């Protein structure tokens, strides 16, 4: 499959969300791989790489991409696509919001990642965040099934037809 | 006080040992501080410091000292002494075991601080830790009060006056 779609989940919130992803992209555009299992060679093998990463323990990485994180350094992402994602609680963590999005950004970004799937920081109730992209933008999509839930289905949609736009899955696809 | 002790704790056992320390030292030697509530001058006051630090979520240092660390990383330890204790649990996070007590070592002895109370792994039953001073001695105290709750004390006793030792507290203060 063109694209590879590697999460990290401790309670199962991203892992659904991977496969919602998967789901709308079709089985046969993308790939589902938890990191856990994952080598340095998995992520190599697409050059199209949709990133799934929660915040866990006052603004920490998901524990299996910590463990992967020396790995993801050694890659050379100059001529891949990325998009990001991951889940997050808004109000018990207001000041930490996600910001296992921006420390992925920040391995991956100065690694040549040509990213897609910013993603407006409106509708959102924090106080601090680490995955913005600029002022009014997280770097992916921010999901919060703690206090949104409600937004979910609605977000991955909207994101992934956004990100299909700015990948041209229509065009590599078939045009 | 000469010697100044900082903990970070989360459910309390890091703060029972620093009450411990201080206890077996006499108020009138070292006095307690959670990290959570102390600045930077707060430590560079002291010539002698204890940092208490427990490993939390897969190998990462407790929250308080992890936001704190940028402010560590910016003080002068040439001329300061340093001992490192924390608590971990060996059974369920085997390969992590103590993680913190090595992070903190090398934020601090890059810059500068002589480090007393390596401690050995005999006893200790984990498959990996970063806090590691060689292949058979811990960079600071380890306590499990999870696994080895009944070694606590004795272990707490006999590194205290292992690094009043090292310290030369005896001469230090009136000879
Ligand atoms: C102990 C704990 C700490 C958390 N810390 C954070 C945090 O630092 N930042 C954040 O945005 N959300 C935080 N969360 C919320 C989780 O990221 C959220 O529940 C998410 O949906 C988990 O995704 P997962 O199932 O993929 O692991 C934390 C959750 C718990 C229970
Ligand atoms: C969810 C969770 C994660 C933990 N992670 C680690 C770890 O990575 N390494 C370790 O040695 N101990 C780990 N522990 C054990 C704690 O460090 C230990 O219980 C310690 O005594 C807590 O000290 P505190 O009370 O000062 O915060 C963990 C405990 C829990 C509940
Ligand atoms: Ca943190
Ligand atoms: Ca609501
Ligand atoms: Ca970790
Ligand atoms: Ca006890
Ligand atoms: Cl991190
Ligand atoms: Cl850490
Ligand atoms: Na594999
Ligand atoms: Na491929
Ligand atoms: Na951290
Ligand atoms: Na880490």
Same mark, same amino acid.
């Given at each position: 499959?063109? /694209?590879?779609?590697?999460?990290?989940?401790?309670?199962? *919130? /991203?892992? *659904?969300?991977?496969?919602?992803?998967?789901?709308?992209?079709?089985?046969? !555009?993308?790939? !589902?791989?938890?990191?856990?299992?994952?080598?340095?060679?998995?992520?190599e093998?697409?050059?199209?790489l949709?990133?799934?990463?929660?915040?866990?323990?006052? +603004?920490?990485?998901?524990?299996?991409?910590? @463990?992967?994180?020396?790995?993801?350094?050694?890659? @050379?992402?100059?001529?891949?696509?990325?998009?990001?994602?991951?889940?997050? @609680?808004?109000?018990?963590?207001?000041?930490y919001?996600?910001?296992?999005?921006?420390?992925?950004?920040?391995?991956?970004?100065?690694? +040549?990642?040509?990213? !897609?799937?910013?993603?407006?920081?409106? +509708?959102?109730?924090?106080?601090?965040?680490?995955?913005?992209?600029?002022?009014? =933008?997280? !770097?992916?999509?921010?999901?919060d099934?703690?206090?949104?839930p409600?937004? /979910?289905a609605?977000?991955?949609?909207?994101?992934?037809?956004?990100?299909?736009?700015?990948? =041209?899955?229509?065009?590599?696809?078939?045009?």
């Amino acid at each position: 499959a063109i /694209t590879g779609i590697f999460f990290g989940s401790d309670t199962g *919130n /991203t892992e *659904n969300i991977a496969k919602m992803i998967q789901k709308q992209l079709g089985k046969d !555009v993308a790939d !589902v791989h938890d990191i856990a299992k994952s080598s340095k060679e998995d992520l190599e093998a697409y050059d199209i790489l949709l990133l799934g990463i929660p915040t866990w323990y006052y +603004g920490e990485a998901q524990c299996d991409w910590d @463990d992967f994180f020396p790995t993801l350094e050694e890659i @050379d992402f100059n001529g891949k696509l990325v998009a990001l994602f991951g889940c997050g @609680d808004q109000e018990d963590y207001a000041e930490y919001f996600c910001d296992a999005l921006g420390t992925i950004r920040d391995i991956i970004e100065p690694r +040549g990642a040509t990213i !897609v799937g910013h993603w407006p920081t409106a +509708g959102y109730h924090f106080e601090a965040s680490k995955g913005l992209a600029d002022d009014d =933008h997280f !770097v992916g999509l921010a999901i919060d099934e703690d206090r949104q839930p409600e937004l /979910t289905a609605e977000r991955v949609e909207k994101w992934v037809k956004q990100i299909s736009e700015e990948l =041209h899955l229509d065009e590599i696809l078939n045009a």
